[PDB]
Amino acid sequence: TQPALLRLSDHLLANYKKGVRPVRDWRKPTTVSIDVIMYAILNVDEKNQVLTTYIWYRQYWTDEFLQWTPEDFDNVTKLSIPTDSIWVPDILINEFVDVGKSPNIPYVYVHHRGEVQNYKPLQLVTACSLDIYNFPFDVQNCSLTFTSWLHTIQDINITLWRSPEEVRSDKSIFINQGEWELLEVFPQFKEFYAEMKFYVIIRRRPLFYAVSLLLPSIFLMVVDIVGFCLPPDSGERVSFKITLLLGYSVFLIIVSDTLPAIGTPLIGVYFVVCMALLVISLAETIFIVRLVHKQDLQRPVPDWLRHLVLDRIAWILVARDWLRVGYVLDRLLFRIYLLAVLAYSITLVTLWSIWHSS
Amino acid sequence: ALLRLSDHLLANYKKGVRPVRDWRKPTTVSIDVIMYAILNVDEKNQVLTTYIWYRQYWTDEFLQWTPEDFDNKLSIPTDSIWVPDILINEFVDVIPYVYVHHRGEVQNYKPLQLVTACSLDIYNFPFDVQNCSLTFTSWLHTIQDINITLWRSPEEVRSDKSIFINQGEWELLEVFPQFKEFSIDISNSYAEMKFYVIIRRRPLFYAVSLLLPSIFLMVVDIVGFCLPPDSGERVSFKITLLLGYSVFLIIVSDTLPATAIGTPLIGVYFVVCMALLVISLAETIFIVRLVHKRPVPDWLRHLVLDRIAWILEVARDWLRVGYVLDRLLFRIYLLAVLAYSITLVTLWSIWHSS
Amino acid sequence: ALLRLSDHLLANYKKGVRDWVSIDVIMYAILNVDEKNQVLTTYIWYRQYWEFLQWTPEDFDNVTKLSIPTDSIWVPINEFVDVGKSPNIPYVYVHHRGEVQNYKPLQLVTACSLDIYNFPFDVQNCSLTFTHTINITLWRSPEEVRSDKSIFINQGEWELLEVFPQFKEFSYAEMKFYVIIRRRPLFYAVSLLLPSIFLMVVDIVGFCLPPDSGERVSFKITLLLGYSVFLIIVSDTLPATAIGTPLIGVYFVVCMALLVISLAETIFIVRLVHKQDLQRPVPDWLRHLVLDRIAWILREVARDWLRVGYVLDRLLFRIYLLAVLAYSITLVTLWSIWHSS
Amino acid sequence: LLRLSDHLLANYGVRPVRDWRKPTTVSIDVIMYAILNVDEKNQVLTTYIWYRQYWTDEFLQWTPEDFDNTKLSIPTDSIWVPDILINEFVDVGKSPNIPYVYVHHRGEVQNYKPLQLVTACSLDIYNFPFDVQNCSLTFTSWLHTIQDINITLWRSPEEVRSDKSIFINQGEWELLEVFPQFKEFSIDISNSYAEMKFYVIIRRRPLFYAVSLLLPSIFLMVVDIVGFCLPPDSGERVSFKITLLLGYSVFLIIVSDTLPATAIGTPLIGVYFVVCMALLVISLAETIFIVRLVHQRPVPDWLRHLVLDRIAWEVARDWLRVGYVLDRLLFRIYLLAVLAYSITLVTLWSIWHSS
Ligand SMILES: NCCc1c[nH]c2ccc(O)cc12
Ligand SMILES: NCCc1c[nH]c2ccc(O)cc12
């Protein structure tokens, strides 16, 4: 009389007992098969040490009660029932801090022989070890673990639905754009209490910061290099250097609010060095120009400085003596700046090597 | 007797069953989306935030009654009778009642603000044209269970912008739905409705803030040759130009969007013009330094002689070398500016014709 | 006696009973506001006051004031859009003779009409409304609501000048509350007005510079870059990506247009001066035009072209001074209209 | 424990114990974790707080004899809570939700919960970047007078003043002291209300700003000072001052974008940037005007008299002297402004450090 589907739903649910595990054989365990497909690394934070991701999470299992003969209920071999009305595995992430406002899937699929499936999108916010040095060419070994929250391995067992190799492959649903590129999802079974571990290794894309940090820094260093060719005994160089210092300060302000942060081998070369070298060069230029132009001859060049400078010139090689000492100091500063820029380029190439590519 | 009608509804239904008489007959979910606003299009994250007025309706076979028996449509509160499993397949981040009709039909309306995952290509910045999508699909049920169909005709939905709030940075061109059949097996086919929303960028602000200063900087840089002589007054001109350009590009790099694919096509010419300007400043400094106050190698003199021949006391030889190098630099400057103008015209033509 | 009283009043009163209210509102702080989305977000204290409970203290251990949970207990915004993350205060307050209280703060998210025309000297008039068929009233007289502003957090972007109520007729006897929030323009004294004034002054200085020199062209182009970066920067301060088009947004484009025109003039003139070869001389009609113009505001062909360029430059300078004076006059006018009212 | 909970809930919101005969009491402890963000524009201080409170109930009391051996966990929603709220509050924020409360067999209920408290506060930006801000968050009850619900401290005030170990101590702002102060709020409804005032003293780290704003500002000032070593006439300095001014404008736009924007007053340094702005513009105008003339004192009454009297405390003969005296006057003004900037910086740092 009643519709076949309605009668099936009644027969199954009105009797269904919310047992600890839906198994008639109470002693033996029941297997829960898991599968995780990554979709996007929405955000990664190094301050909060969290990793916001979107993963399509599907857990399979079989129930002893939710089985019926298709002979009755009009040859029906497939059914859908509300999630919370039945028992679902008590599987939780060992690491999650919060879960975002993912859509609420209310249905849990069932099959006539007792099989159950529960798909659900899952926007985790999990806390992991973030180590940002080698930026912008970073590689993160992020991972997360699934486990039975209260039950032990003797109650419910966790295993893959697909072979480990298939899970490891870079599945095609992922959004391969933007900062973070997914290398692999490497699963590992640890079986404490069943414990299933996925190793999500994500590699940053350095070209993302080609304009933000690479091009501006390279250009500022090159501009300072060409500026060093200007004579040191004129206000031309002073104006050039001070405007370049303003450029460096504006660059620092601009990146400080964008650069994910104290210390980073890219940023230990930028501003601890080039800003300090620029400031020292500007200070010495100001002092030399002021002293030479005032021409008061308040003091001659002291002997100790004379000997020290005539010794140091070998490394690179009365107002006129002051001009000469200023010039040789300027050449020494130019040599040091050349060394700094060479070290920067070497470091960038070395980092691009560890960030194996091409 | 609407309370009695509600009690009659509550007496039998349980939300776990598909409202259909024959389980073999798939439920048909009528769908329609109206684009209201495009809050943001984040190029770095590749997320198209947007606001959509989402409306759907499906038949409910068991929910039929005679209106006169209850004093003659009804609304039901939260914990509604049933709802399909339609999901926006590109969702990555984000009304409590439904309407019913006496003839066995249900209605649902929703203001839904989305954070959708899109494929953004910023090559043509600032004149971008995006082709973002929206894939509504049955997350769990198959084709045998739920089928999605457009409420309104595809022509009606393609051109419908009266609700769209034109104010913003982006412009709406279309919302073009097309039905597909996703198959994970011979059976178990899923029905998915794809609304390909197309949008453009409004380039006025970027034309006036990015393209105008860049074009004028290139033009005045070219002018640096003409009146300023080959030595002397040109050094300070180039110095000021370079110092202004450095800060301008610091800010531009702060402003231009970047993606894994790479920089916008326009962003290549800023770097080219910087290289040219730095080279010009260096060579002008060199000429000024040498002419005033070296071996002047003969092979270099022959090289420059061959170059000029193919283009179309020692200080004078230095001056001739400087003149030839300046002519070469002017030729390259003109070529670069012509290329920049041609690319701007091409990008604008593509953006407009779209 | 507390639990016995609770059970007694629970059994005595039903939710469905109203034969089948006084409101006091205090403003605390104004949250996000902007032209976009036309929403006013604020934090507000809402005190509510308005028989079955009516019980005698003597029969209940002389108890006089018993709190009750709000779960399934009956209690009495038109501009409503959202209520925000306000606390979920669960209890309610009752008195012995039936008097009931209910206090709870709200982070109201209400849609309102805002003008940006007078930005940043902007004074806005927004009103919240309270609104079963016909009654709602106020705890105090309308004039008393004004003094409540003294508790407002007044150091934010907006002042709160006055909160003034009114009564209407259930078309809930719609109660009106009119609140006047006056923008504080000293946020933008450094963000917006100071760079504008400085760029105008610097551009003024860069006009007595010789009109045929290289330094003139370098100065003008560097100022153009400065204007462009200023436009890029403040474009995030104002809600609109382009120029927001307040009355002051006009003067952010007039100056740039004049600077561009002056730059084009200067480059054209230097280009002509560089060409010492014979060239189209200044035709008689342009000579007459420039003669008439200069007469009303006050190496040969090259000299005449240079003079034409000079007079055109002085025309540009005159119009630019006029524009700057207009900008200053409008600024003082807006300050007067904002301060007076 | 299951049977204990069943019985406790079966025999069990309401006010716990005999208020008319004996007031109740709630104790609260505040642990400061991190100052996520302090907003100088909106005047809202965002902080992460670990909040603990306990109060003595009467219904949930039992003995180990009743159920085999002292502590139990019960759902948060079902049982009555002390109704404590922070008045200096704007938004809840995002923080973990805790489902279960703790209860001790003797009758003590313990509640732990961290909350991302977004508070409205009075920020004094005048001192920026050497900024010390006394920000207070207060706990009080409104539907319950002092008789209905008192409030007290979990531990001694000296401890909570000292306890800052859990603080991350990373970011822009430090944390100096979290010291409470109990006050009895008197209101018309009832002659006493109980409120717990917690004062939070934070402090900015000026290293980033010292090397981003102050260093280039001081260097621009000094470079301008040495600019006067160039001759007052001639175009060598005209190019110098032009380059300086063009750099200063682009620097200043970004600086203005950077500084905090409180209404009461812009930073005490923001005045000196404007002062040097004006001085540089005046110097540029002076040098351009001087070079314009030299390459004849028409109004001696205004021009000659002032220059003649100034030093007391044919273009070369007339104008060049005026140009030189103007240059020296402007140099003296520049020196005074730079000295004032230096003294203000030293004073601000002294105030910040002595805090
Ligand atoms: N989410 C698992 C089932 C499903 C529904 N729609 C899909 C689209 C693509 C895909 O790989 C899978 C699916
Ligand atoms: N009658 C309610 C008084 C009240 C509630 N919250 C408050 C906060 C502060 C204050 O002074 C007073 C109050």
mmCIF file of C-alpha atoms in Angstrom, chain C residues 2-3 6 28-32 43 45 47 61-69 71 85-87 89-93 95 101-105 107 153 155-157 184 186-192 194-195 197-199 201-202 205-206 208-209 215 218-219 222-223 225-227 229-230 233-234 237, chain D residues 13-16 19-21 40-44 59 79-83 85-93 120-122 142-145 147-148 187 189 193 235 238-240 242-243 245-250 252-254 256-257 259-264 266 270 274 277-278 281 284-285 288 292:
data_model
loop_
_atom_site.group_PDB
_atom_site.id
_atom_site.type_symbol
_atom_site.label_atom_id
_atom_site.label_comp_id
_atom_site.label_asym_id
_atom_site.label_seq_id
_atom_site.Cartn_x
_atom_site.Cartn_y
_atom_site.Cartn_z
ATOM 1 C CA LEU C 2 13.173 30.059 44.689
ATOM 2 C CA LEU C 3 12.465 26.786 42.872
ATOM 3 C CA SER C 6 9.863 29.287 39.563
ATOM 4 C CA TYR C 28 27.676 52.874 22.508
ATOM 5 C CA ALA C 29 29.888 52.773 19.403
ATOM 6 C CA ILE C 30 29.636 53.076 15.620
ATOM 7 C CA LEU C 31 31.328 50.263 13.713
ATOM 8 C CA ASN C 32 32.103 50.025 9.984
ATOM 9 C CA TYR C 43 26.853 48.694 18.928
ATOM 10 C CA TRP C 45 22.261 48.944 24.333
ATOM 11 C CA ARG C 47 16.606 48.151 27.513
ATOM 12 C CA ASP C 61 9.849 33.737 51.833
ATOM 13 C CA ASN C 62 9.535 37.494 51.187
ATOM 14 C CA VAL C 63 11.443 37.160 47.906
ATOM 15 C CA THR C 64 11.117 40.317 45.814
ATOM 16 C CA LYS C 65 13.065 39.836 42.557
ATOM 17 C CA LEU C 66 13.536 36.501 40.777
ATOM 18 C CA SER C 67 15.322 35.971 37.476
ATOM 19 C CA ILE C 68 13.961 33.505 34.922
ATOM 20 C CA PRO C 69 15.326 31.927 31.759
ATOM 21 C CA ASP C 71 13.417 29.864 27.103
ATOM 22 C CA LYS C 85 27.692 38.369 16.721
ATOM 23 C CA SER C 86 25.787 39.763 19.692
ATOM 24 C CA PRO C 87 25.898 37.787 22.963
ATOM 25 C CA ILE C 89 21.971 36.448 26.993
ATOM 26 C CA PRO C 90 19.595 33.665 28.139
ATOM 27 C CA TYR C 91 18.039 35.016 31.356
ATOM 28 C CA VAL C 92 15.217 37.501 31.926
ATOM 29 C CA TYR C 93 14.317 39.637 34.941
ATOM 30 C CA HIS C 95 9.619 41.737 39.803
ATOM 31 C CA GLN C 101 12.899 43.779 32.509
ATOM 32 C CA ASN C 102 15.052 42.667 29.595
ATOM 33 C CA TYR C 103 18.451 44.229 28.869
ATOM 34 C CA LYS C 104 20.650 43.104 25.994
ATOM 35 C CA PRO C 105 23.215 44.735 23.668
ATOM 36 C CA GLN C 107 25.605 44.843 17.116
ATOM 37 C CA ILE C 153 32.702 56.142 22.502
ATOM 38 C CA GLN C 155 36.911 59.172 19.648
ATOM 39 C CA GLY C 156 36.251 57.024 16.571
ATOM 40 C CA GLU C 157 35.802 58.334 13.041
ATOM 41 C CA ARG C 184 35.608 63.768 12.102
ATOM 42 C CA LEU C 186 41.019 65.126 11.231
ATOM 43 C CA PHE C 187 41.650 61.526 10.222
ATOM 44 C CA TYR C 188 42.226 62.781 6.688
ATOM 45 C CA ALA C 189 44.245 65.861 7.652
ATOM 46 C CA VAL C 190 47.357 63.740 7.115
ATOM 47 C CA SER C 191 45.980 61.018 4.850
ATOM 48 C CA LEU C 192 44.243 63.132 2.201
ATOM 49 C CA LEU C 194 48.100 67.306 3.503
ATOM 50 C CA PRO C 195 49.481 65.484 0.425
ATOM 51 C CA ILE C 197 48.153 70.748 -0.398
ATOM 52 C CA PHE C 198 51.823 69.793 -0.623
ATOM 53 C CA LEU C 199 51.584 68.604 -4.217
ATOM 54 C CA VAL C 201 52.375 73.950 -3.531
ATOM 55 C CA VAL C 202 55.265 72.027 -5.092
ATOM 56 C CA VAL C 205 57.025 76.206 -7.170
ATOM 57 C CA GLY C 206 57.780 74.228 -10.321
ATOM 58 C CA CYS C 208 58.859 79.784 -12.024
ATOM 59 C CA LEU C 209 61.423 77.238 -13.202
ATOM 60 C CA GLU C 215 65.069 70.684 -15.212
ATOM 61 C CA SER C 218 62.333 66.499 -15.198
ATOM 62 C CA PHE C 219 60.417 68.298 -12.449
ATOM 63 C CA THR C 222 58.526 63.518 -11.448
ATOM 64 C CA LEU C 223 55.506 65.441 -10.169
ATOM 65 C CA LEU C 225 54.706 60.233 -11.012
ATOM 66 C CA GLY C 226 54.083 61.621 -7.527
ATOM 67 C CA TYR C 227 50.485 62.419 -8.431
ATOM 68 C CA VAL C 229 51.361 57.216 -6.749
ATOM 69 C CA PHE C 230 49.210 59.477 -4.572
ATOM 70 C CA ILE C 233 47.641 55.023 -2.554
ATOM 71 C CA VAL C 234 44.563 56.955 -1.440
ATOM 72 C CA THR C 237 41.450 54.831 1.660
ATOM 73 C CA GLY D 13 18.271 27.121 35.021
ATOM 74 C CA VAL D 14 17.891 28.812 38.398
ATOM 75 C CA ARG D 15 19.825 30.875 40.929
ATOM 76 C CA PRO D 16 21.700 28.242 42.926
ATOM 77 C CA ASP D 19 19.864 34.302 47.639
ATOM 78 C CA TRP D 20 17.391 36.012 49.974
ATOM 79 C CA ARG D 21 19.337 34.528 52.903
ATOM 80 C CA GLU D 40 44.326 53.122 15.968
ATOM 81 C CA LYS D 41 41.617 54.148 13.489
ATOM 82 C CA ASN D 42 38.573 52.306 14.865
ATOM 83 C CA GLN D 43 39.806 52.508 18.495
ATOM 84 C CA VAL D 44 39.275 48.757 19.020
ATOM 85 C CA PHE D 59 22.503 21.375 43.582
ATOM 86 C CA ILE D 79 23.398 24.143 33.846
ATOM 87 C CA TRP D 80 23.131 27.710 35.105
ATOM 88 C CA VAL D 81 26.030 30.090 34.437
ATOM 89 C CA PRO D 82 27.026 33.177 36.437
ATOM 90 C CA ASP D 83 26.027 35.733 33.754
ATOM 91 C CA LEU D 85 29.873 39.947 30.530
ATOM 92 C CA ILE D 86 32.578 42.359 29.376
ATOM 93 C CA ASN D 87 31.140 45.834 28.865
ATOM 94 C CA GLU D 88 34.187 47.091 26.919
ATOM 95 C CA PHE D 89 33.224 44.595 24.232
ATOM 96 C CA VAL D 90 32.377 44.832 20.531
ATOM 97 C CA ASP D 91 32.658 41.464 18.784
ATOM 98 C CA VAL D 92 32.969 37.856 19.915
ATOM 99 C CA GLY D 93 35.470 36.773 17.275
ATOM 100 C CA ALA D 120 36.719 49.198 22.407
ATOM 101 C CA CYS D 121 39.541 51.182 23.977
ATOM 102 C CA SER D 122 40.999 54.682 24.269
ATOM 103 C CA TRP D 142 23.863 43.990 35.077
ATOM 104 C CA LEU D 143 20.710 41.957 35.746
ATOM 105 C CA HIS D 144 22.306 40.947 39.071
ATOM 106 C CA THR D 145 23.269 43.510 41.698
ATOM 107 C CA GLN D 147 23.569 41.017 46.362
ATOM 108 C CA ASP D 148 22.429 38.873 43.430
ATOM 109 C CA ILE D 187 23.252 52.606 40.155
ATOM 110 C CA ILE D 189 18.144 50.324 40.309
ATOM 111 C CA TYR D 193 26.806 46.629 41.352
ATOM 112 C CA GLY D 235 71.864 76.270 -10.154
ATOM 113 C CA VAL D 238 68.621 74.240 -7.453
ATOM 114 C CA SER D 239 69.058 70.740 -8.861
ATOM 115 C CA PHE D 240 70.016 69.487 -5.397
ATOM 116 C CA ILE D 242 64.741 69.829 -6.642
ATOM 117 C CA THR D 243 65.891 66.237 -6.188
ATOM 118 C CA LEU D 245 61.906 67.883 -2.749
ATOM 119 C CA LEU D 246 60.886 65.311 -5.345
ATOM 120 C CA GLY D 247 62.124 62.543 -3.056
ATOM 121 C CA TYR D 248 60.453 64.105 -0.023
ATOM 122 C CA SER D 249 57.030 64.304 -1.665
ATOM 123 C CA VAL D 250 56.968 60.639 -2.674
ATOM 124 C CA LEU D 252 55.720 61.749 2.517
ATOM 125 C CA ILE D 253 52.740 60.334 0.641
ATOM 126 C CA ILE D 254 53.669 56.842 1.832
ATOM 127 C CA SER D 256 51.099 59.690 5.622
ATOM 128 C CA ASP D 257 49.576 56.435 4.402
ATOM 129 C CA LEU D 259 50.959 56.758 10.307
ATOM 130 C CA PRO D 260 48.016 56.071 12.636
ATOM 131 C CA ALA D 261 45.055 58.403 12.266
ATOM 132 C CA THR D 262 43.431 59.031 15.644
ATOM 133 C CA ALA D 263 41.107 62.038 15.799
ATOM 134 C CA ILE D 264 42.359 63.586 19.046
ATOM 135 C CA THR D 266 48.172 62.960 14.872
ATOM 136 C CA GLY D 270 53.736 64.064 12.280
ATOM 137 C CA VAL D 274 55.124 68.919 7.966
ATOM 138 C CA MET D 277 58.097 69.862 4.228
ATOM 139 C CA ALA D 278 57.435 73.586 4.601
ATOM 140 C CA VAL D 281 59.579 74.260 -0.037
ATOM 141 C CA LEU D 284 63.511 75.809 -2.947
ATOM 142 C CA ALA D 285 61.437 78.925 -3.597
ATOM 143 C CA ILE D 288 64.872 79.649 -7.483
ATOM 144 C CA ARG D 292 66.091 84.148 -11.268
#
